Structure formats: structure tokens, C-alpha cells
């Protein structure tokens, strides 16, 4: 049967029993960190014929051959890879050979056969028969051919049974083990598979087949599998799923059905049943199976554990990246200021709306609030003591807010307070008021002219600080 998604086997060999019914592993297979006992015997899963992504064996000892486990693995489709590799075999102690003696096609990605001290029967395999892109294989740290002394079936008596290819200007016999030769097909068949008796398969059959010229006798499909048939494409009203099979809509619509997911569910876009809409699309309603183009960066509501996000750096604003709506409060408190105003804007420039309030305090690094490039509205659903939506205090260099000519912003509810911005002419402050519609909701210690703009050419008034500021 089909088992998915990626099976992750490890620490106990006995976990390899999770694989006893799988004929197809829809996803990857990981076998790490296991140690088979020389004492205890062994498993063997002849049912496994296909793995839709990659096969990765890492740091496993006691296993002396993979054909021992998967004597019938025939295709590793490589629909998703472990970093370019469809087949990774690393630090596999004891492994004396690959033995994957029915492996006939790695549809995608390459292979990595690294530090396997005793691995042999390695130079005797013709990976170009199995893989296209052999140039990308990565091989090193295995057992040296001259110490291996491999002999293909027949070599020792005197009736070679294996075929010969040339690999790296060496013309020799190809085989997976001493008793098993690598299978090849009659040239007649061309780019097609063939039976055990060298009979060509249907052009759709991938890997191999039970009866020639029959598209229902495949061991795998070249393209898509469907209703017992290797199809060259999915039939109308059935959709590609996982790169290898066609599934109808109620199947797609019922995939998380054994689970209580609060997430938006599977969608069907461009003929494929997939868990999520394509990059610039959005589901046209919540839990609709239909994806529609966003028409700009897709809407994205960001909301964190705490209510007030305090951005005290450029690194701290990382999470804001991509967001259109910040549900919470922004406390922008940036002191250190190389040039964080273009860096910040690649993080905060997309925010159109803040649901809470915006507090700018101690932000000496800043000269303008213009990196909030998309901010169109502040909702004021939560406000500082006093009823403040917009609160700006102790800002040494702030010269402007936003450009009150090139830009528009609105404060649905709440009011503002300004203090201790020496480079910030009250004029801007007075303009912002008109624009945001917060004009008229302001007390008058709010916009003081004694410590706001005091040291900037402009064009409770002549004092630097006052009792009015202790309020
Ligand atoms: C999300 O998208 C689905 C799928 O719709 C398809 O893709 C969309 C992205 C868009 O391209 C659609 O045009 C396309 O179908 C939407 O499902 C469709 O939903 C509409 C909603 O009513 C259905 O159409 C209706 O069919 C009725 C029965 O035949 C017909 O009576 C209706 O006509 C009456 O109402 C219309 C609509 O307002 C009116 O203009 C007419 O004059 C008349 O009074 C109406 O056409 C489609 O059949 C849909 N179903 C399917 C299976 O495709 C889905 O609604 C949408 N979700 C959200 C939240 O928008
Ligand atoms: C391993 O198997 C694939 C199977 O081919 C598929 O079916 C073809 C008829 C074609 O339409 C492809 O899309 C399918 O992948 C081999 O790769 C295909 O090779 C054919 C012929 O070279 C080529 O036209 C396709 O583009 C290839 N398909 C893909 C996805 O690349 C591949 O060559 C086989 N590897 C070896 C060593 O034989
Ligand atoms: C597989 O099937 C057998 C019998 O149907 C069952 O006992 C075993 O628990 C199953 N293993 C899995 C992983 O399904
Ligand atoms: C292929 O083989 C199956 C069973 O042997 C058969 O029933 C099906 O009809 C065959 N396909 C053709 C085209 O004959």
C-alpha cells in the first residue's frame, strides 16, 4: 500500500517494521542511527517498489546490504531531494554492497555514497543506466576496488553472465553483487522498460513490468498512476498529487479528515491537489479549495505572543517582514543608527495597518518614520494610558514623520502626544494632525512648543522643560 508522508525510522531496528505493508512510500524514507545485532536475524520488505522522493541511510551498522531490506525497490522518483541527492548512503558501517538489484531508475536528483569503509560492488554499477545526471554524483571514502576484489556472476568459474559497459574508460562487467548482475534491456526496446525475459514494456511503464506491451502491468509509472493504469496525464476531474498519481476532489477535500486542523485546508490549483496555494495566490474564501491571484503582496496578518512588539534594532524587525497588518502594538525604540532606514523598510515597509498604537521612544538612530512606507492606518484598538494612539518621546534626531504631501495616514481612534524631539518642527506635528483626522482630540500638553523643535530651524513656550511635562 501507499505509506506517507516521509517515514523517519531510527534508533531501533525494530522500527523497520513500520514498513511492512508499503508498496509505495509517498514521501521520503530516512533510516538513521540504528545498529542491527549480528545475533538477531533480519527483515526484508519485498513489497516496496517505489519511493516518491529520496532514500537516505545514515550511520547504520550491522546492515550488510540494502538489497537485504529492499530487494525490489525499483524507482526513487526524486520528486523532492535531500539537497540535490535522490539517494544518500553515509557512514554505513558493515555495508558490504548496495545490493539494490532491481533499482532501474532514479527519475530525479543524484546520489551520494560517502564514507562507507567496507562498501564494495560499487565500481561495478553503471549509474548512467539508472540516472541521467551522473556528473553530479558525489562518491568518496568507500572501500578501494583493489581491496574489494569484486567478481561479477560467472567471472570466477568461466561463464560471465553479466553485460559490459564502459565507465571512465574502463570496459567491464556490470553487477550489484557476486550473484547478481545489473539488469539491462534489449536495445530493440529503446528508451523503454522490459520484462525479466527482455520483452519491452509499454512506453508508460517505468522501471519494469510483468507483461510486455500492457500499461496495467507496470512496476511503476513514467508519469502518473491512475486506477490501475500508468497514464501519461491525469484524466478529467482527477488531479496530480505528490508528483505521481491522480486523485479526485473529494479525496483532496478529505485528506486531513483524520485530524483536527485549525489550518486552512488543501486546495486544487492548476490541476494539482496540493496543501497550499501557489506563492502569489490566496484562497478566495476561508477553506475554499480555489486559489486566486493576490494583485500585490498577498495579505498577511502578523500577530505575536505578546501584544507590544518592541523593535529595538533591525534584526528585531525581521518577523515584521512580509506583513500587511500588525495586530498588536509597535514600540519603536532604536538608538544605534548606522543607517537603518532602508534596512528597516525591507522589513516594515509593507505594513499598511497597525491595530493597536504606535510608540516611538528613544529612537535616536532615526530622522524620519518614512520606512513605514505602506502604513495607511492606525486603528487605536489599544492605547496608552491617556488615550494615546501615537506617542513620540525623547527622539534626538527625528526631523520628520512621513511626507505630508506624498503620503496619507489615519488614526481611527485615540490621540497623540509629542515630547522631547528637538529636531522636529511642530509644523510637521501640526500637519500630521490634519491628515490623520486626530485634529481636535488633543489636550495641549500633547503638542508642546517648549521641547519639540526647540533646536531646529522652523518658520510653556520659552522654557526647556516644565511642570506640564511632569504630567
Ligand atoms: C471561490 O471560487 C469558487 C470556484 O469558482 C470558480 O473560480 C472562482 C475563483 C471564479 O473564477 C468563479 O467564477 C469560478 O466559478 C466559487 O464557486 C463558484 O461559486 C459561484 C457562487 O455563486 C457559483 O455560481 C453560481 O451558480 C448558481 C447555480 O448555477 C447560479 O445560480 C448563480 O447565479 C446567480 O448568482 C450569480 C452570482 O452572484 C448572479 O450573477 C447570476 O445572475 C444569478 O443570479 C451563480 O452563478 C459557481 O457555480 C461556483 N461553484 C463552482 C463549483 O465552481 C466560490 O463561490 C468562491 N468562494 C468565495 C468565498 O467567493
Ligand atoms: C528515468 O526515468 C525518466 C522517465 O521519463 C518520463 O517519461 C518520459 C516519456 C518524459 O515525458 C519525461 O517527462 C518523464 O520523466 C527519464 O527522464 C525522462 O527522459 C525522457 C527521455 O530522455 C525525457 O524526454 C524526459 O524529459 C525525462 N523526464 C524527466 C522528468 O526528466 C530518465 O531518463 C530515466 N533515467 C535513465 C538513466 O534512464
Ligand atoms: C499492516 O497490516 C497488518 C495486517 O493487515 C497489520 O497487522 C500491521 O499492523 C500493519 N502495519 C501498518 C504499519 O499498517
Ligand atoms: C492487459 O492485461 C490485463 C490483464 O492481463 C488485461 O485484462 C487488459 O485488457 C490488457 N490490456 C490490453 C490492451 O489488452
mmCIF file of N, CA and C in Angstrom, residues 85-201:
data_model
loop_
_atom_site.group_PDB
_atom_site.id
_atom_site.type_symbol
_atom_site.label_atom_id
_atom_site.label_comp_id
_atom_site.label_asym_id
_atom_site.label_seq_id
_atom_site.Cartn_x
_atom_site.Cartn_y
_atom_site.Cartn_z
ATOM 1 N N UNK A 85 20.292 15.289 -3.727
ATOM 2 C CA UNK A 85 20.565 13.849 -3.795
ATOM 3 C C UNK A 85 19.236 13.111 -3.720
ATOM 4 N N UNK A 86 19.062 12.137 -4.534
ATOM 5 C CA UNK A 86 17.926 11.224 -4.502
ATOM 6 C C UNK A 86 18.255 10.006 -3.669
ATOM 7 N N UNK A 87 19.555 9.758 -3.425
ATOM 8 C CA UNK A 87 19.916 8.511 -2.802
ATOM 9 C C UNK A 87 21.104 8.785 -1.917
ATOM 10 N N UNK A 88 21.048 8.850 -0.599
ATOM 11 C CA UNK A 88 22.237 9.227 0.184
ATOM 12 C C UNK A 88 22.592 8.045 1.061
ATOM 13 N N UNK A 89 23.773 7.519 1.083
ATOM 14 C CA UNK A 89 24.265 6.445 1.894
ATOM 15 C C UNK A 89 25.536 6.895 2.621
ATOM 16 N N UNK A 90 25.396 7.341 3.875
ATOM 17 C CA UNK A 90 26.516 7.877 4.637
ATOM 18 C C UNK A 90 26.878 7.173 5.931
ATOM 19 N N UNK A 91 28.131 6.818 6.164
ATOM 20 C CA UNK A 91 28.708 6.264 7.325
ATOM 21 C C UNK A 91 27.947 5.023 7.700
ATOM 22 N N UNK A 92 27.781 4.194 6.735
ATOM 23 C CA UNK A 92 27.000 2.962 6.831
ATOM 24 C C UNK A 92 28.026 1.932 7.166
ATOM 25 N N UNK A 93 28.287 1.735 8.442
ATOM 26 C CA UNK A 93 29.213 0.645 8.826
ATOM 27 C C UNK A 93 28.675 -0.734 8.519
ATOM 28 N N UNK A 94 29.551 -1.642 8.126
ATOM 29 C CA UNK A 94 29.270 -3.024 7.849
ATOM 30 C C UNK A 94 28.811 -3.227 6.422
ATOM 31 N N UNK A 95 28.334 -2.193 5.761
ATOM 32 C CA UNK A 95 27.648 -2.363 4.465
ATOM 33 C C UNK A 95 28.659 -2.872 3.466
ATOM 34 N N UNK A 96 28.424 -4.048 2.925
ATOM 35 C CA UNK A 96 29.437 -4.619 2.050
ATOM 36 C C UNK A 96 29.023 -4.403 0.604
ATOM 37 N N UNK A 97 27.832 -3.896 0.326
ATOM 38 C CA UNK A 97 27.420 -3.557 -1.021
ATOM 39 C C UNK A 97 26.063 -2.889 -1.076
ATOM 40 N N UNK A 98 25.691 -2.303 -2.201
ATOM 41 C CA UNK A 98 24.420 -1.553 -2.175
ATOM 42 C C UNK A 98 23.349 -2.597 -2.217
ATOM 43 N N UNK A 99 23.433 -3.519 -3.151
ATOM 44 C CA UNK A 99 22.604 -4.592 -3.465
ATOM 45 C C UNK A 99 21.237 -4.319 -4.017
ATOM 46 N N UNK A 100 20.823 -3.082 -4.170
ATOM 47 C CA UNK A 100 19.621 -2.633 -4.806
ATOM 48 C C UNK A 100 19.562 -3.174 -6.216
ATOM 49 N N UNK A 101 19.473 -4.491 -6.362
ATOM 50 C CA UNK A 101 19.487 -5.208 -7.588
ATOM 51 C C UNK A 101 18.240 -5.172 -8.380
ATOM 52 N N UNK A 102 17.239 -4.420 -8.060
ATOM 53 C CA UNK A 102 16.163 -4.094 -9.047
ATOM 54 C C UNK A 102 16.046 -2.616 -9.227
ATOM 55 N N UNK A 103 17.031 -1.800 -8.729
ATOM 56 C CA UNK A 103 16.871 -0.347 -8.899
ATOM 57 C C UNK A 103 17.106 0.019 -10.367
ATOM 58 N N UNK A 104 16.123 0.495 -11.124
ATOM 59 C CA UNK A 104 16.320 0.766 -12.507
ATOM 60 C C UNK A 104 16.142 2.209 -12.891
ATOM 61 N N UNK A 105 15.720 3.059 -11.986
ATOM 62 C CA UNK A 105 15.545 4.451 -12.373
ATOM 63 C C UNK A 105 15.441 5.388 -11.204
ATOM 64 N N UNK A 106 16.287 6.368 -11.087
ATOM 65 C CA UNK A 106 16.210 7.472 -10.191
ATOM 66 C C UNK A 106 15.729 8.615 -11.029
ATOM 67 N N UNK A 107 14.480 9.029 -11.038
ATOM 68 C CA UNK A 107 13.855 9.902 -12.007
ATOM 69 C C UNK A 107 14.437 11.270 -11.830
ATOM 70 N N UNK A 108 15.047 11.555 -10.688
ATOM 71 C CA UNK A 108 15.462 12.937 -10.414
ATOM 72 C C UNK A 108 16.467 13.056 -9.285
ATOM 73 N N UNK A 109 17.405 13.982 -9.457
ATOM 74 C CA UNK A 109 18.468 14.163 -8.485
ATOM 75 C C UNK A 109 19.530 13.097 -8.567
ATOM 76 N N UNK A 110 20.585 13.212 -7.791
ATOM 77 C CA UNK A 110 21.785 12.406 -7.938
ATOM 78 C C UNK A 110 21.984 11.563 -6.703
ATOM 79 N N UNK A 111 23.134 11.003 -6.530
ATOM 80 C CA UNK A 111 23.410 10.141 -5.425
ATOM 81 C C UNK A 111 24.711 10.478 -4.672
ATOM 82 N N UNK A 112 24.719 10.149 -3.380
ATOM 83 C CA UNK A 112 25.865 10.462 -2.547
ATOM 84 C C UNK A 112 26.235 9.252 -1.733
ATOM 85 N N UNK A 113 27.328 8.592 -2.067
ATOM 86 C CA UNK A 113 27.772 7.375 -1.426
ATOM 87 C C UNK A 113 29.110 7.632 -0.766
ATOM 88 N N UNK A 114 29.093 8.107 0.454
ATOM 89 C CA UNK A 114 30.172 8.625 1.241
ATOM 90 C C UNK A 114 30.503 7.857 2.523
ATOM 91 N N UNK A 115 31.737 7.914 2.946
ATOM 92 C CA UNK A 115 32.486 7.177 3.880
ATOM 93 C C UNK A 115 31.871 5.828 4.221
ATOM 94 N N UNK A 116 31.903 4.862 3.353
ATOM 95 C CA UNK A 116 31.498 3.506 3.673
ATOM 96 C C UNK A 116 32.646 2.562 3.531
ATOM 97 N N UNK A 117 33.523 2.615 4.517
ATOM 98 C CA UNK A 117 34.753 1.853 4.535
ATOM 99 C C UNK A 117 34.759 0.490 3.903
ATOM 100 N N UNK A 118 33.718 -0.299 4.096
ATOM 101 C CA UNK A 118 33.783 -1.657 3.520
ATOM 102 C C UNK A 118 32.871 -1.841 2.332
ATOM 103 N N UNK A 119 32.359 -0.772 1.774
ATOM 104 C CA UNK A 119 31.407 -0.906 0.667
ATOM 105 C C UNK A 119 32.122 -1.350 -0.580
ATOM 106 N N UNK A 120 31.596 -2.362 -1.247
ATOM 107 C CA UNK A 120 32.228 -2.786 -2.487
ATOM 108 C C UNK A 120 31.111 -2.927 -3.492
ATOM 109 N N UNK A 121 31.384 -3.596 -4.607
ATOM 110 C CA UNK A 121 30.321 -3.757 -5.606
ATOM 111 C C UNK A 121 29.833 -2.371 -5.866
ATOM 112 N N UNK A 122 30.773 -1.425 -5.921
ATOM 113 C CA UNK A 122 30.407 -0.025 -6.180
ATOM 114 C C UNK A 122 30.845 0.494 -7.532
ATOM 115 N N UNK A 123 32.117 0.153 -7.847
ATOM 116 C CA UNK A 123 32.637 0.482 -9.182
ATOM 117 C C UNK A 123 32.065 -0.389 -10.287
ATOM 118 N N UNK A 124 31.372 -1.475 -9.900
ATOM 119 C CA UNK A 124 30.807 -2.413 -10.829
ATOM 120 C C UNK A 124 29.352 -2.056 -11.131
ATOM 121 N N UNK A 125 28.855 -0.885 -10.823
ATOM 122 C CA UNK A 125 27.497 -0.487 -11.163
ATOM 123 C C UNK A 125 27.528 0.637 -12.190
ATOM 124 N N UNK A 126 26.616 0.620 -13.157
ATOM 125 C CA UNK A 126 26.582 1.638 -14.210
ATOM 126 C C UNK A 126 25.412 2.550 -13.936
ATOM 127 N N UNK A 127 25.677 3.558 -13.081
ATOM 128 C CA UNK A 127 24.674 4.520 -12.668
ATOM 129 C C UNK A 127 24.030 5.314 -13.787
ATOM 130 N N UNK A 128 24.650 5.296 -14.971
ATOM 131 C CA UNK A 128 24.103 6.087 -16.076
ATOM 132 C C UNK A 128 22.899 5.364 -16.683
ATOM 133 N N UNK A 129 22.842 4.061 -16.470
ATOM 134 C CA UNK A 129 21.685 3.275 -16.805
ATOM 135 C C UNK A 129 20.460 3.569 -15.912
ATOM 136 N N UNK A 130 20.734 3.905 -14.652
ATOM 137 C CA UNK A 130 19.798 4.251 -13.615
ATOM 138 C C UNK A 130 19.535 5.744 -13.522
ATOM 139 N N UNK A 131 20.603 6.542 -13.718
ATOM 140 C CA UNK A 131 20.411 8.007 -13.556
ATOM 141 C C UNK A 131 20.936 8.758 -14.789
ATOM 142 N N UNK A 132 20.259 9.817 -15.159
ATOM 143 C CA UNK A 132 20.725 10.650 -16.226
ATOM 144 C C UNK A 132 21.982 11.416 -15.836
ATOM 145 N N UNK A 133 21.878 12.350 -14.935
ATOM 146 C CA UNK A 133 22.820 13.290 -14.392
ATOM 147 C C UNK A 133 23.853 12.690 -13.466
ATOM 148 N N UNK A 134 24.618 11.723 -13.947
ATOM 149 C CA UNK A 134 25.641 11.070 -13.177
ATOM 150 C C UNK A 134 26.804 11.980 -12.837
ATOM 151 N N UNK A 135 26.958 13.071 -13.622
ATOM 152 C CA UNK A 135 28.023 14.001 -13.351
ATOM 153 C C UNK A 135 27.962 14.637 -11.970
ATOM 154 N N UNK A 136 26.839 14.682 -11.338
ATOM 155 C CA UNK A 136 26.534 15.262 -10.057
ATOM 156 C C UNK A 136 26.647 14.269 -8.910
ATOM 157 N N UNK A 137 26.910 13.013 -9.172
ATOM 158 C CA UNK A 137 27.043 12.065 -8.110
ATOM 159 C C UNK A 137 28.260 12.525 -7.298
ATOM 160 N N UNK A 138 28.313 12.221 -6.022
ATOM 161 C CA UNK A 138 29.323 12.544 -5.085
ATOM 162 C C UNK A 138 29.823 11.339 -4.349
ATOM 163 N N UNK A 139 30.932 10.759 -4.686
ATOM 164 C CA UNK A 139 31.425 9.496 -4.221
ATOM 165 C C UNK A 139 32.815 9.632 -3.599
ATOM 166 N N UNK A 140 32.997 9.137 -2.393
ATOM 167 C CA UNK A 140 34.252 9.254 -1.691
ATOM 168 C C UNK A 140 34.169 8.548 -0.380
ATOM 169 N N UNK A 141 35.231 7.857 -0.037
ATOM 170 C CA UNK A 141 35.557 7.397 1.286
ATOM 171 C C UNK A 141 35.061 5.960 1.392
ATOM 172 N N UNK A 142 34.928 5.378 0.192
ATOM 173 C CA UNK A 142 34.382 3.994 0.216
ATOM 174 C C UNK A 142 35.529 3.028 0.149
ATOM 175 N N UNK A 143 35.304 1.736 0.052
ATOM 176 C CA UNK A 143 36.365 0.759 0.046
ATOM 177 C C UNK A 143 37.031 0.669 -1.327
ATOM 178 N N UNK A 144 38.359 0.577 -1.360
ATOM 179 C CA UNK A 144 39.144 0.635 -2.591
ATOM 180 C C UNK A 144 39.033 -0.600 -3.431
ATOM 181 N N UNK A 145 38.627 -0.433 -4.698
ATOM 182 C CA UNK A 145 38.328 -1.510 -5.629
ATOM 183 C C UNK A 145 39.274 -2.666 -5.639
ATOM 184 N N UNK A 146 40.562 -2.366 -5.537
ATOM 185 C CA UNK A 146 41.673 -3.299 -5.446
ATOM 186 C C UNK A 146 41.634 -4.098 -4.156
ATOM 187 N N UNK A 147 41.296 -3.505 -3.016
ATOM 188 C CA UNK A 147 40.987 -4.321 -1.836
ATOM 189 C C UNK A 147 39.607 -4.984 -1.915
ATOM 190 N N UNK A 148 38.594 -4.468 -2.607
ATOM 191 C CA UNK A 148 37.336 -5.176 -2.756
ATOM 192 C C UNK A 148 37.489 -6.478 -3.503
ATOM 193 N N UNK A 149 38.117 -6.449 -4.683
ATOM 194 C CA UNK A 149 38.236 -7.652 -5.497
ATOM 195 C C UNK A 149 36.899 -8.208 -5.971
ATOM 196 N N UNK A 150 36.006 -7.361 -6.448
ATOM 197 C CA UNK A 150 34.665 -7.774 -6.796
ATOM 198 C C UNK A 150 34.666 -8.710 -7.969
ATOM 199 N N UNK A 151 33.779 -9.686 -7.995
ATOM 200 C CA UNK A 151 33.683 -10.536 -9.167
ATOM 201 C C UNK A 151 32.229 -10.756 -9.555
ATOM 202 N N UNK A 152 31.884 -10.367 -10.751
ATOM 203 C CA UNK A 152 30.506 -10.412 -11.166
ATOM 204 C C UNK A 152 30.137 -11.871 -11.333
ATOM 205 N N UNK A 153 28.842 -12.170 -11.315
ATOM 206 C CA UNK A 153 28.400 -13.542 -11.527
ATOM 207 C C UNK A 153 29.082 -14.161 -12.740
ATOM 208 N N UNK A 154 29.701 -15.313 -12.570
ATOM 209 C CA UNK A 154 30.365 -16.039 -13.624
ATOM 210 C C UNK A 154 31.872 -15.854 -13.741
ATOM 211 N N UNK A 155 32.400 -14.700 -13.350
ATOM 212 C CA UNK A 155 33.782 -14.346 -13.518
ATOM 213 C C UNK A 155 34.744 -15.388 -12.998
ATOM 214 N N UNK A 156 34.460 -15.932 -11.828
ATOM 215 C CA UNK A 156 35.316 -16.892 -11.158
ATOM 216 C C UNK A 156 35.279 -18.279 -11.787
ATOM 217 N N UNK A 157 34.120 -18.814 -12.165
ATOM 218 C CA UNK A 157 34.123 -20.097 -12.862
ATOM 219 C C UNK A 157 34.645 -19.878 -14.287
ATOM 220 N N UNK A 158 33.810 -19.315 -15.151
ATOM 221 C CA UNK A 158 34.220 -19.061 -16.503
ATOM 222 C C UNK A 158 33.049 -18.966 -17.465
ATOM 223 N N UNK A 159 32.048 -18.255 -17.004
ATOM 224 C CA UNK A 159 30.865 -18.019 -17.824
ATOM 225 C C UNK A 159 30.211 -16.747 -17.299
ATOM 226 N N UNK A 160 30.863 -15.642 -17.651
ATOM 227 C CA UNK A 160 30.324 -14.361 -17.238
ATOM 228 C C UNK A 160 28.855 -14.340 -17.620
ATOM 229 N N UNK A 161 28.007 -13.991 -16.648
ATOM 230 C CA UNK A 161 26.588 -13.819 -17.002
ATOM 231 C C UNK A 161 26.194 -12.356 -17.157
ATOM 232 N N UNK A 162 26.999 -11.432 -16.589
ATOM 233 C CA UNK A 162 26.632 -10.034 -16.769
ATOM 234 C C UNK A 162 27.102 -9.376 -18.057
ATOM 235 N N UNK A 163 26.372 -8.393 -18.523
ATOM 236 C CA UNK A 163 26.718 -7.486 -19.591
ATOM 237 C C UNK A 163 27.862 -6.531 -19.211
ATOM 238 N N UNK A 164 28.461 -5.851 -20.191
ATOM 239 C CA UNK A 164 29.575 -4.977 -20.075
ATOM 240 C C UNK A 164 29.267 -3.588 -20.600
ATOM 241 N N UNK A 165 29.693 -2.578 -19.812
ATOM 242 C CA UNK A 165 29.585 -1.193 -20.329
ATOM 243 C C UNK A 165 30.979 -0.598 -20.128
ATOM 244 N N UNK A 166 31.163 0.621 -20.641
ATOM 245 C CA UNK A 166 32.442 1.266 -20.291
ATOM 246 C C UNK A 166 32.158 2.471 -19.414
ATOM 247 N N UNK A 167 32.825 2.608 -18.290
ATOM 248 C CA UNK A 167 32.622 3.733 -17.367
ATOM 249 C C UNK A 167 34.056 4.253 -17.148
ATOM 250 N N UNK A 168 34.250 5.546 -17.314
ATOM 251 C CA UNK A 168 35.565 6.164 -17.161
ATOM 252 C C UNK A 168 36.733 5.560 -17.932
ATOM 253 N N UNK A 169 36.513 5.225 -19.199
ATOM 254 C CA UNK A 169 37.465 4.439 -19.977
ATOM 255 C C UNK A 169 37.923 3.140 -19.361
ATOM 256 N N UNK A 170 37.012 2.377 -18.850
ATOM 257 C CA UNK A 170 37.224 1.000 -18.417
ATOM 258 C C UNK A 170 36.017 0.215 -18.940
ATOM 259 N N UNK A 171 36.259 -0.757 -19.767
ATOM 260 C CA UNK A 171 35.182 -1.590 -20.312
ATOM 261 C C UNK A 171 35.099 -2.872 -19.496
ATOM 262 N N UNK A 172 34.088 -2.969 -18.635
ATOM 263 C CA UNK A 172 33.938 -4.159 -17.784
ATOM 264 C C UNK A 172 32.506 -4.538 -17.449
ATOM 265 N N UNK A 173 32.418 -5.668 -16.800
ATOM 266 C CA UNK A 173 31.173 -6.302 -16.380
ATOM 267 C C UNK A 173 30.453 -5.511 -15.288
ATOM 268 N N UNK A 174 29.155 -5.268 -15.514
ATOM 269 C CA UNK A 174 28.334 -4.549 -14.520
ATOM 270 C C UNK A 174 27.449 -5.461 -13.668
ATOM 271 N N UNK A 175 27.445 -5.333 -12.371
ATOM 272 C CA UNK A 175 26.710 -6.134 -11.417
ATOM 273 C C UNK A 175 26.544 -5.559 -10.026
ATOM 274 N N UNK A 176 25.492 -6.040 -9.301
ATOM 275 C CA UNK A 176 25.234 -5.446 -7.964
ATOM 276 C C UNK A 176 25.887 -6.268 -6.885
ATOM 277 N N UNK A 177 26.105 -7.549 -7.190
ATOM 278 C CA UNK A 177 26.666 -8.425 -6.136
ATOM 279 C C UNK A 177 27.442 -9.505 -6.871
ATOM 280 N N UNK A 178 28.138 -10.396 -6.233
ATOM 281 C CA UNK A 178 28.697 -11.606 -6.732
ATOM 282 C C UNK A 178 27.687 -12.519 -7.416
ATOM 283 N N UNK A 179 26.453 -12.534 -6.926
ATOM 284 C CA UNK A 179 25.433 -13.393 -7.537
ATOM 285 C C UNK A 179 24.378 -12.672 -8.319
ATOM 286 N N UNK A 180 24.435 -11.363 -8.402
ATOM 287 C CA UNK A 180 23.505 -10.585 -9.185
ATOM 288 C C UNK A 180 24.180 -9.494 -10.030
ATOM 289 N N UNK A 181 23.865 -9.582 -11.289
ATOM 290 C CA UNK A 181 24.191 -8.736 -12.383
ATOM 291 C C UNK A 181 23.198 -7.576 -12.470
ATOM 292 N N UNK A 182 23.672 -6.509 -13.068
ATOM 293 C CA UNK A 182 22.853 -5.313 -13.159
ATOM 294 C C UNK A 182 21.970 -5.628 -14.356
ATOM 295 N N UNK A 183 20.689 -5.337 -14.329
ATOM 296 C CA UNK A 183 19.860 -5.691 -15.462
ATOM 297 C C UNK A 183 19.878 -4.599 -16.500
ATOM 298 N N UNK A 184 19.911 -5.020 -17.762
ATOM 299 C CA UNK A 184 19.875 -4.099 -18.910
ATOM 300 C C UNK A 184 18.750 -4.588 -19.806
ATOM 301 N N UNK A 185 18.261 -3.874 -20.775
ATOM 302 C CA UNK A 185 17.241 -4.309 -21.701
ATOM 303 C C UNK A 185 17.720 -4.397 -23.136
ATOM 304 N N UNK A 186 17.078 -5.212 -23.957
ATOM 305 C CA UNK A 186 17.495 -5.322 -25.358
ATOM 306 C C UNK A 186 17.383 -3.940 -25.969
ATOM 307 N N UNK A 187 18.421 -3.548 -26.693
ATOM 308 C CA UNK A 187 18.474 -2.291 -27.417
ATOM 309 C C UNK A 187 17.225 -2.016 -28.231
ATOM 310 N N UNK A 188 16.678 -3.063 -28.840
ATOM 311 C CA UNK A 188 15.383 -3.038 -29.505
ATOM 312 C C UNK A 188 14.369 -2.170 -28.777
ATOM 313 N N UNK A 189 14.171 -2.402 -27.476
ATOM 314 C CA UNK A 189 13.270 -1.693 -26.628
ATOM 315 C C UNK A 189 13.537 -0.213 -26.576
ATOM 316 N N UNK A 190 14.739 0.274 -26.826
ATOM 317 C CA UNK A 190 14.976 1.700 -26.902
ATOM 318 C C UNK A 190 15.048 2.326 -25.512
ATOM 319 N N UNK A 191 14.320 3.390 -25.293
ATOM 320 C CA UNK A 191 14.170 4.066 -24.030
ATOM 321 C C UNK A 191 13.036 3.455 -23.208
ATOM 322 N N UNK A 192 12.565 2.240 -23.484
ATOM 323 C CA UNK A 192 11.522 1.599 -22.758
ATOM 324 C C UNK A 192 12.042 0.541 -21.776
ATOM 325 N N UNK A 193 11.118 0.228 -20.838
ATOM 326 C CA UNK A 193 11.482 -0.817 -19.902
ATOM 327 C C UNK A 193 11.275 -2.176 -20.569
ATOM 328 N N UNK A 194 11.645 -3.245 -19.888
ATOM 329 C CA UNK A 194 11.442 -4.548 -20.442
ATOM 330 C C UNK A 194 11.237 -5.546 -19.299
ATOM 331 N N UNK A 195 10.751 -6.722 -19.646
ATOM 332 C CA UNK A 195 10.404 -7.722 -18.668
ATOM 333 C C UNK A 195 11.644 -8.385 -18.165
ATOM 334 N N UNK A 196 11.549 -9.391 -17.355
ATOM 335 C CA UNK A 196 12.647 -10.222 -16.924
ATOM 336 C C UNK A 196 13.160 -11.008 -18.121
ATOM 337 N N UNK A 197 12.339 -11.261 -19.137
ATOM 338 C CA UNK A 197 12.702 -12.015 -20.333
ATOM 339 C C UNK A 197 12.904 -11.027 -21.476
ATOM 340 N N UNK A 198 13.468 -9.876 -21.135
ATOM 341 C CA UNK A 198 13.780 -8.872 -22.149
ATOM 342 C C UNK A 198 12.645 -8.632 -23.107
ATOM 343 N N UNK A 199 11.452 -8.411 -22.594
ATOM 344 C CA UNK A 199 10.357 -8.078 -23.509
ATOM 345 C C UNK A 199 10.020 -6.619 -23.256
ATOM 346 N N UNK A 200 10.001 -5.776 -24.277
ATOM 347 C CA UNK A 200 9.681 -4.394 -23.993
ATOM 348 C C UNK A 200 8.373 -4.193 -23.253
ATOM 349 N N UNK A 201 8.262 -3.130 -22.472
ATOM 350 C CA UNK A 201 7.093 -2.749 -21.721
ATOM 351 C C UNK A 201 6.393 -1.650 -22.500
#
